[PDB]
Each structure stands twice: as structure tokens, then as C-alpha cells.
């Protein structure tokens, strides 16, 4: 019974651990020696999208790489024209407790996610002159922690409860529910192919899922504390997680091993947000030590700092073409960085 | 172009309306409510009028905003920092829960759990300078609860006075001195009674005190 199940679980644990360690030698540091290590990004603040008056929790760019949405504790959702720093839209929110947000693939629904446990969807290109809420995705017990967009009618959200869910915006009911986690699910990212989505939880473990079926494809472990930021590689078969244990771990979708653990001794604070550049080479992580950081994915070294934030940097995202990066922070400033030379 | 000029005018209009909203929001005082179970958090959300209850009980020219959050049966580490900017934390402890041990958890008279909660709340890195109001939720029934069983199995070090003076002089002091940073933050305390308005007048006084103190730290003179 219980003893038999425990023995089977222990036997399965040995098999998966040995399989992960059976990848030949795979000395990452020894073999990862290329002639293109980023020395110092030194990205300068091209624009400062001032105007938020509270801690900024999430920012998401657009399909056009020009409009970006931003969510903050002031109960405000702002669509910026990052090209000329113009507020295209300012959507007031029912709940001032956003923790994450997104932009529809058609950048027409910028549904976000908050502790009220509901993604209220906001129609942008409507016939009327104002942006209005279309449908609210109710049915979650925990706080919404990563509320994303597959298409104009399909949204998958991460909640505080140890379960994720896929919804139909038109009907408002969960077409699927993904319940494999044990603790507080904190983040969730969608692959470019929109067939698998990987979500990280406070159980120090991240699990992929199949959107169509509702079963976790596979799990990954290794973190010493709770995850608070996950993001998909632009390739789509990889992802890096930012936990409170002051390290960033990269896990391939297939292999259960860790490519690199991005951390430094001087940092005793965890990572709050993680995004990726279009090259799959510039991992930007928003740390708690009042400034963002730029990590390369190959050398696992701190190849850049973005020390322009007064308070803790809480969110950041890179454009679809790699043009910019809008790192929001608890100091209420969205700094849009672009490298110059 | 005339298009970009109109876009810039629209953006400036958004700036103006948004700054007005932020300055209005600023006036809204926030109060995170963290009583335990059986702590009459209800008695408080009732007479002063999924996930959370952002009760707006603005009553005396103060834009009150009490976030009653007890429905989140989840880890408190990753959503308590969202309340960094908050005037005060309204903690509720049931005084009568001083002899009732947990049936399943086998806890220490349902008080060491409350003491651990108060220590965790009053010592977060996000609550160093945030004042805490404490509400003795079940003080009225504690007089009856102490007449039949005393405070000796839990704290034999208590002096004993057979009245609620002993309760004030045994556990209230323990809650007060549990504040490690006795200088940065103040721990206001009150007895949650059936008074019509005293239970909220104490809250209002604590808000006005924390407000003034914060304003003194805003004009660079404190």
C-alpha cells in the first residue's frame, strides 16, 4: 500500500536521477568556450517611461515590438508607445494587485492576472473609443501568478493554488485544468509553437504541460528555494527559472539536467523576473538588489548590469525583434534600454 | 506630423488624468488585516462598513482601504511584500484562545502559533517601519475563560491576579516586547470590544499618528 508506493517512488527517483547523470561527461564549463562572450552590455536608458506611481509588477511587449503593456500596484494598466514614450492607453483595473500580465497575439486583448484570482480581458482595437473588459476568467482559488495568451480566445493562467488552467475566453470556462504541482505556482511561460507551456512553482520544481490534453509532460528540480520567475527560451525547448535562492537555473525541455546556475556570491537576494533576448544569448533577470542584471546563457557569467533603478527591479521583457528591453521596477519607472555603439 | 502632435497631446492627457488618479490614490490609506482564525476579523469587517476582500470603509474623511485576506490558503511569502506601502497592519489575536489546544496540530494553547505569527509579521524586511495595531479579539469572554482555568500550564511565570488585569500584565506585555525593532516601528494595542466606534476610533488614531510621522519623514525634517 503506502509502503509499496513509497518504494516505487524511491525506485523511480533513482532511475530518473541516473538517467539525468547518464549524459556522458557533458562538462559544461569545459566545452562551452566560444569566441563571442559578451563583455559588458552597458545598455543606456534610451527612454524613461515615467508616469507609474507605485511598484511595477509586470510588463509585456507587443507583436509589433513598439507597444508595451505595464501593470503596477496603483491599479493602472498602461500601453506605452515606447518609440516616442506616449501613453496609447491607460486601463484602470478593478484590482490593484496585479502580479503578472500579457498582450494578446493580436495585441487586442491585454488580459492580466492578479490576486483577485481572475484574468479580466481588455479589448484594445474595439469599435468604441475606449478599452473595455470583455470576459473575466473566474474559477481559481489561489492568486493568479502568470496569466498568458495563446490566441484571441485561448488563455492559460498560473494561480496560487497548485494548479494551472487553460480557458476559453468566449465561454469563460476552463477547457482544461493542469494540477500537478504541490505548492504556490508563481510563474508560467508559453512556447513559440504554442503547444507546450512550462510553469514554475514554490515547490522548487518546474513542470511542462500539454495544452490540448492537460497532463504534465515532465518535471525538473534542483532549486534550493521557491521559484518566482520563469520564461521560455526563444527556441521553445528550454527555459530558465528565477527563484528566491539568489540563482537562475536553465533547464532543457527534454533533458532534466541543469545547463548552468547563474549566481554570484555578492548577491544574497533572489530573482524577481526573467526574460530572454531574441538571440537566445542575453538572459536578463530582475534581481531584488535594487537593480536589474544581464546574464549570458553560454558562459554563465554576469555580462551586463542595468543599474538605473532606485528600488527593486520587478519585471522586464525584451521585444520580439530584440530592439529594446523595458525593465519595470518598484521605483515606478520603466527604463527602456537599447545598446549603442 | 499633425498625427504625432495629436498623439503627443493624447499622451499628455493620459499623463494628466493618470497623475490625478495617482494623487487621489495616494490619499487612500491602506490597512492589511492579519488576524488568525477564530479572531473576529469578522467582528471588524462587519461593524465598520475568493482571494481577498478590499473593504472600503472610508468614514471620517479618510479614504480607508482594509484588505481582509484570509481566504488565501497559500504561502504568505510571495504576496505580503505587495503591502510594503501600507499605513499599518491590523493584527487580530483571540485572547480566549489561550487554553484551547489544537485538536489535530496539538499546538500550545493556540497562543505560540499566534506568537510565532506576530514575530513573523513584526520582523519582515518589508515591515520594518510599518506600525502594527493589535486587537485583543476575545477579551470579553477571556474573563469567563480565566475564572475556571488559569494561565499556568502555558506560562507558569505569570504572577496571577484572577482578573483581566492579569491578562493585560501577562500576555499583552509579551506581545509588546516581542517587537525587536522597538525604535523604528510602534506597536499600538487595543482590546477588541463591542463598542460602537472605539474599536475603529483607535484605528483612526493610529492611522493619524502614522500619517503625521510619515509626513515628518517626507519634508526632510525627521
Amino acid at each position, epitope marked *: 500500500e503506502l509502503d509499496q508506493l513509497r518504494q516505487e517512488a524511491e525506485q523511480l527517483k533513482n532511475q530518473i536521477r541516473d538517467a539525468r547523470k547518464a549524459c556522458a561527461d557533458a562538462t559544461l564549463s569545459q566545452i562551452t568556450n566560444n569566441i563571442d562572450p559578451v563583455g559588458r552590455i552597458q545598455m543606456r536608458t534610451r527612454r524613461t517611461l515615467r508616469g507609474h506611481l507605485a511598484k511595477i509588477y509586470a510588463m509585456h511587449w507587443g507583436t*509589433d515590438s*513598439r*507597444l508595451l503593456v505595464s501593470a503596477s500596484q496603483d491599479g493602472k494598466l498602461i500601453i506605452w*508607445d515606447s*518609440y516616442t514614450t*506616449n501613453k*496609447v*492607453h491607460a486601463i484602470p483595473l478593478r484590482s490593484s494587485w496585479v502580479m503578472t500580465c500579457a498582450y494578446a497575439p493580436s495585441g487586442n486583448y491585454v488580459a492580466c492576472g492578479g490576486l483577485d484570482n481572475i484574468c479580466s480581458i481588455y479589448n484594445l482595437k474595439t*469599435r*468604441e*473609443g*475606449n478599452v473595455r473588459v470583455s470576459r473575466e476568467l473566474a474559477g481559481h482559488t489561489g492568486y493568479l501568478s502568470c496569466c498568458r495568451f495563446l490566441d484571441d480566445n485561448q488563455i492559460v493562467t498560473s494561480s496560487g493554488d497548485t494548479t494551472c488552467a487553460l480557458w476559453d475566453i468566449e465561454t469563460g470556462q476552463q477547457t482544461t485544468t493542469f494540477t500537478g504541482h504541490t505548492g504556490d505556482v508563481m510563474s508560467l511561460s508559453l512556447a513559440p509553437d504554442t503547444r507546450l507551456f512550462v510553469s514554475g512553482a514554490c515547490d522548487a520544481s518546474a513542470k511542462l504541460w500539454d495544452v490540448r490534453e492537460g497532463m504534465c509532460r515532465q518535471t525538473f528540480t534542483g532549486h534550493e528555494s521557491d521559484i518566482n520567475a520563469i520564461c521560455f527560451f526563444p527556441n521553445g525547448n528550454a527555459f530558465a527559472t528565477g527563484s528566491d535562492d539568489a540563482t537562475c537555473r536553465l533547464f532543457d525541455l527534454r533533458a532534466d539536467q541543469e545547463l548552468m546556475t547563474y549566481s554570484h556570491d555578492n548577491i544574497i537576494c533572489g530573482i524577481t523576473s526573467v526574460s530572454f533576448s531574441k538571440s537566445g544569448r542575453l538572459l536578463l533577470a530582475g534581481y531584488d538588489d535594487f537593480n536589474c542584471n544581464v546574464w549570458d546563457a553560454l558562459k554563465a557569467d554576469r555580462a551586463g548590469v542595468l543599474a538605473g533603478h532606485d528600488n527593486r527591479v520587478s519585471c522586464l521583457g525584451v521585444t520580439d525583434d530584440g530592439m529594446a528591453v523595458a525593465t519595470g521596477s518598484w521605483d515606478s519607472f520603466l527604463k527602456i534600454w537599447n545598446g549603442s555603439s | *506630423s*499633425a*498625427e*504625432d*502632435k*495629436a*498623439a503627443v*497631446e*493624447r499622451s*499628455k*492627457m493620459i499623463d494628466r488624468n493618470l497623475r490625478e488618479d495617482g494623487e487621489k490614490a495616494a490619499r487612500e490609506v491602506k490597512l492589511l488585516l492579519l488576524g488568525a482564525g477564530e479572531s473576529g476579523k469578522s467582528t471588524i469587517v462587519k461593524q465598520m462598513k475568493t482571494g481577498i476582500v478590499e473593504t472600503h470603509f472610508t468614514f471620517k474623511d479618510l479614504h480607508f482601504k482594509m484588505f481582509d485576506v484570509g481566504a488565501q490558503r497559500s504561502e504568505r511569502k510571495k504576496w505580503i511584500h505587495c503591502f510594503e506601502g501600507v499605513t499599518a497592519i491590523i493584527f487580530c489575536v483571540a485572547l480566549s484562545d489561550y487554553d484551547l489546544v489544537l485538536a489535530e496540530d496539538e499546538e500550545m494553547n493556540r497562543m505560540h502559533e499566534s506568537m510565532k505569527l506576530f514575530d513573523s509579521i513584526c520582523n519582515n524586511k518589508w515591515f520594518t517601519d510599518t506600525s502594527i495595531i493589535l486587537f485583543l479579539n476575545k477579551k470579553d469572554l477571556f474573563e469567563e475563560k480565566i475564572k475556571k482555568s488559569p494561565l499556568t500550564i502555558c506560562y507558569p511565570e505569570y504572577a496571577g491576579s484572577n482578573t483581566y488585569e492579569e491578562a493585560a500584565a501577562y500576555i499583552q506585555c509579551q506581545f509588546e516586547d516581542l517587537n525587536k525593532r522597538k525604535d523604528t516601528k510602534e506597536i499600538y494595542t487595543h482590546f477588541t470590544c463591542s463598542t460602537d466606534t472605539k474599536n475603529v476610533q483607535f484605528v483612526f488614531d493610529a492611522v493619524t499618528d502614522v500619517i503625521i510621522k510619515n509626513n515628518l519623514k517626507d519634508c526632510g525634517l525627521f
Partner: single-chain antibody, 233 residues
Framework: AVQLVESGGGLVQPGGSRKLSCSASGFAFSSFGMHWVRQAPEKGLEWVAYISSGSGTIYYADTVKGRFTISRDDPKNTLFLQMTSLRSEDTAMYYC??????????????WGQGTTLTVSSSDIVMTQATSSVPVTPGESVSISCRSSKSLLHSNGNTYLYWFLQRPGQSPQLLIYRMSNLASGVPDRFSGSGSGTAFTLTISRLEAEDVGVYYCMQHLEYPLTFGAGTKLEL
């Protein structure tokens, strides 16, 4: 549900004054910039005035400067245009057209029904020799216009606005910015060009597609119209 209806037009004794009221419903006019467009009988359109979103920017017609004034009020959700000293030439079909100005928006999308005003008894210039092309329905129709100077702004948007005026109806935006299709318009309409050279293309012509086509410029402060191609039965 968008409904722009005009009022305050008809016959007025010479030398008088009248107020043109545009009633707005079905949309948030407070976030919209309102224009006024004239149309002389058997001729092209022409600009009266414009108010930006929030009244922070105004403009006026060169031939109506000072004489005509435009005032909006968002509380009551309607638009006014007061004109004084109505001359004999101030007799045309007046249209009330909305426009929202932000990135990727759709200016000059919805035109009002329009009201007529009659009386008793530098800028961009259009060079269009052709104004009546008898084309039978069924095959492709190509419409073109001419502009004085270049349209390609440093923003990259050639602010050329196409419109179709149906017989006994209101103008409709076909392709704003010379390259992007508007809302509620069949995909058969198309428009492309480079700077001063541009054209409007229709794959197939329907019975309802008959009407006079028009071209508009928005680069500079004045928005000069012209007498575009007219399609006959």
C-alpha cells in the same frame, strides 16, 4: 451603434449666422478628435475645422479662417460649429467625421450622415484631369490621385486617406494612410504607392461599389481635398 447625426442646416437669409451641431452616440467622443468636412454640390469635399482630443489643438480652413469657429463639449457628448457672415459660396454638404489619434489608430473612419446649408440670392494642391471614368461592374478598377509634395514623413506614414461617396449617402474610409484597410470594408479594396505616386485598386466591382472616389492629405496642417474619380452607371 456609432451614430453621428448633424443638425442646424438648410436655408438662411444672406449675411446671417448658423450653428452646426454634430450629435455623437455609440462611441467615446471624449477620446476622439472631431473634424468638419464640406462638400460643394457636383464637386469635391473641403475642410471646415478640426478639434483635437481635449481641445488642446485647433485648426481652421484657409477660406474660413476666423469666420468659422468649432467647439466641442464632452459632458453633453456633441459637437458644435458656429459660422458667421454666411456668403453665397458658403453652400455645401457638411459632414461630421471622427478621428482618434494614437499609434496605429484609424483616423477619419466614421463619417456622419451630413447636413446641407444653403443661402438665397502654400497649401497642397490637387491636379486631377480625369474626374469621370465610365467603368462597367465586373473587373478591376484602378483610381489614382496627384499630390503636390512628398508624403513619406520621417514617421514612415504616408498620410493619404481614401474615401468612397455613395450616391445619396455618406463618405466611407477605404484605406487610411494609403496602405492600411479600414474597418467594416470588404477586402477587395486596396491601395499602395510610394510618396507622390500612388493608386487605389479594386479587384471586383459590385453594384453597390458605384460612387465617386476621393483622396485626402494629412501631412501638413491644412487637409486639402480634391475632385476625385467618379464612377458612372
Amino acid at each position: 451603434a456609432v451614430q453621428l447625426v448633424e443638425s442646424g442646416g438648410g436655408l438662411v437669409q444672406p449675411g446671417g449666422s448658423r450653428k452646426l451641431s454634430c450629435s455623437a452616440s455609440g462611441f467615446a467622443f471624449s477620446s476622439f478628435g472631431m473634424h468638419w468636412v464640406r462638400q460643394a454640390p457636383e464637386k469635391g469635399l473641403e475642410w471646415v475645422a478640426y478639434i483635437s482630443s481635449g481641445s488642446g489643438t485647433i485648426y481652421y480652413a484657409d477660406t474660413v479662417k476666423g469666420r468659422f469657429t468649432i467647439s466641442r463639449d464632452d459632458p453633453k457628448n456633441t459637437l458644435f460649429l458656429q459660422m458667421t457672415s454666411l456668403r453665397s459660396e458658403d453652400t455645401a454638404m457638411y459632414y461630421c467625421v471622427r478621428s482618434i489619434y494614437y499609434y496605429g489608430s484609424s483616423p477619419f473612419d466614421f463619417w456622419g450622415q451630413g447636413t446641407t446649408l444653403t443661402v438665397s440670392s502654400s497649401d497642397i494642391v490637387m491636379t486631377q484631369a480625369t474626374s469621370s471614368v465610365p467603368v462597367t461592374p465586373g473587373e478591376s478598377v484602378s483610381i489614382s490621385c496627384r499630390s503636390s509634395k512628398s508624403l513619406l514623413h520621417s514617421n514612415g506614414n504616408t498620410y493619404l486617406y481614401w474615401f468612397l461617396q455613395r450616391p445619396g449617402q455618406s463618405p466611407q474610409l477605404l484605406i487610411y494612410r494609403m496602405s492600411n484597410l479600414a474597418s467594416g470594408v470588404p477586402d477587395r479594396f486596396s491601395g499602395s504607392g510610394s510618396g507622390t505616386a500612388f493608386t487605389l485598386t479594386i479587384s471586383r466591382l459590385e453594384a453597390e461599389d458605384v460612387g465617386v472616389y476621393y483622396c485626402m492629405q494629412h501631412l501638413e496642417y491644412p487637409l486639402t481635398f480634391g475632385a476625385g474619380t467618379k464612377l458612372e452607371l
